[PDB]
Design a protein around this ligand. Structure first.
Ligand code: NA
Length: 441
């Protein structure tokens, strides 16, 4: 049967945010109660829910009468986008044994035995718990990757899916890939609360927050092909995305990191001159088994509109024409290629920052595009000359300029157009904005 049909027909709850109101769009009309300090922030396709650590920051879904999806051995799947800040070393030491729920159907401290399910966090662990009407429990505990640049609980939007087959296992997926599993046979009936609560419960860190988007429940255990289609269905191409998965924005400082060389930063030789890569320093902590290349070193770039004639949007759309600037010594310097400027073998055109030679045309019309690698939050940049001919995608080339050391130098080249299906490509860039959810230790 057709996967899109299966996904639609089996949906019994689906939270959407429209006109700054959270509601259920499944067709079953569960009631959604938004408490005063539940916040809305940018999400994977619109806005998302943002929860901070106080009693007022919660969203409660009161299930419609008609939806009993998970009682009496019925199979079910819960999915949602999740964004959790990178936990500091200090906070892993202080709070790393504190398990706190963020989404739950279990009623605690009341008459109920507490049956239902929960999503919880504990340090760098993501935990799925089921509890039946007799109080018996099953859990999945997923331990995140140690390299926080590539980890799932380290400030990027990631897509969670938990399937529950009452005759076999619960299975945790992240970004469509199976990450954890537990047998759940032997559990009895689940008698959960009429409410599903999105709230930090029993979190000891006052400064903790999370973001949750597209919360959804299905009345079957989705299979891997279904989960892959569901995951990719959300990756809308309208707007480009920054490193964290949020919409890319105009007039906002970003550090650039090449996807194909992710432990490199970008540096400027001098005003009017070229840019090149350097090695990023790393933070390591063996005791905690975390490490990562440090962020926020290197040049700050700003994307400006090329010549707006319609509506001003703060977000950058794929296909927008832009001017790219470097913010350096309290000014903004255009990035472009001068006519007849230095190039490698006449084809790999060396970019220049703040070039200003009198009488020399400087080509600076760019287009911000997403031509490849749908699952990765990366961007390509295309440069045009004054006759709107392509001078290439922005990438790097190894070589030397004058007597300088050998460097990986930023260029524009049309070579990349013949290689867009490659797994890794040197024209793919991460745009990384400074963010409270990632501070280097
Ligand atoms: Na090259």
């Amino acid at each position: 049967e057709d996967i899109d049909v299966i996904l639609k027909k089996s949906t019994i709850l689906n939270l959407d945010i429209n006109n700054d109101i959270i509601s259920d769009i499944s067709g079953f009309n569960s009631s959604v109660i938004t408490y005063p300090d539940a916040q809305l922030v940018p999400g994977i396709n619109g806005k998302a829910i943002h929860l901070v650590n106080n009693e007022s920051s919660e969203v409660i879904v009161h299930k419609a009468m008609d939806i009993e999806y998970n009682d009496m051995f019925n199979n079910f799947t819960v999915s949602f986008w999740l964004r959790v800040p990178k936990v500091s070393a200090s906070h892993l030491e202080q709070y790393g044994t504190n398990e706190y729920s963020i989404i739950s159907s279990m009623k605690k401290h009341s008459l109920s035995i507490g049956s239902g399910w929960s999503v919880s966090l504990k340090g760098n662990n993501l935990i799925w718990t089921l509890k039946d009407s007799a109080g018996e429990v099953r859990q999945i505990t997923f331990r995140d990757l140690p390299d926080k640049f590539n980890a799932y609980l380290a400030n990027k939007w990631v897509f969670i899916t938990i399937t529950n087959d009452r005759l076999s296992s619960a299975n945790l997926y992240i970004n469509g890939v199976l990450m954890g599993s537990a047998e759940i046979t032997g559990l009895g009936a689940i008698r959960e609360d009429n409410n599903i609560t999105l709230k930090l419960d029993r979190c000891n860190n006052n400064n903790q927050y999370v973001s949750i988007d597209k919360f959804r429940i299905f009345c079957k255990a989705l299979n891997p092909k279904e989960i892959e289609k569901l995951y990719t269905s959300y990756l809308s191409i309208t707007f480009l995305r920054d490193f964290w998965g949020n919409p890319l924005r105009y007039d906002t400082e970003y550090y650039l990191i090449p996807v194909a060389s992710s432990s490199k930063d970008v540096q400027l030789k001098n005003i009017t001159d070229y840019m090149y890569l350097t090695n990023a320093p790393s933070y390591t902590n063996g005791k905690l088994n975390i490490y990562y290349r440090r962020l926020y070193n290197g040049l700050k770039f700003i994307i400006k509109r090329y010549t707006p004639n319609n509506e001003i949007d703060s977000f950058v759309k794929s296909g927008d024409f832009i001017k790219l600037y470097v913010s350096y010594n309290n000014n903004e310097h255009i990035v472009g290629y001068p006519k007849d400027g230095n190039a490698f073998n006449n084809l790999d055109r060396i970019l220049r920052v703040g070039y200003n030679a009198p009488g020399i045309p400087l080509y600076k019309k760019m287009e911000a595009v997403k031509l490849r690698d749908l699952k990765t939050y990366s961007v390509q940049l295309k440069l045009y000359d004054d006759k709107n001919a392509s001078l290439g995608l922005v990438g790097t080339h190894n070589g030397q300029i004058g007597n300088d050391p050998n460097r990986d130098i930023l260029i524009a080249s049309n070579w990349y157009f013949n290689h867009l299906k490659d797994k890794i490509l040197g024209c793919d860039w991460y745009f990384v904005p400074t963010d409270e959810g990632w501070t280097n230790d």
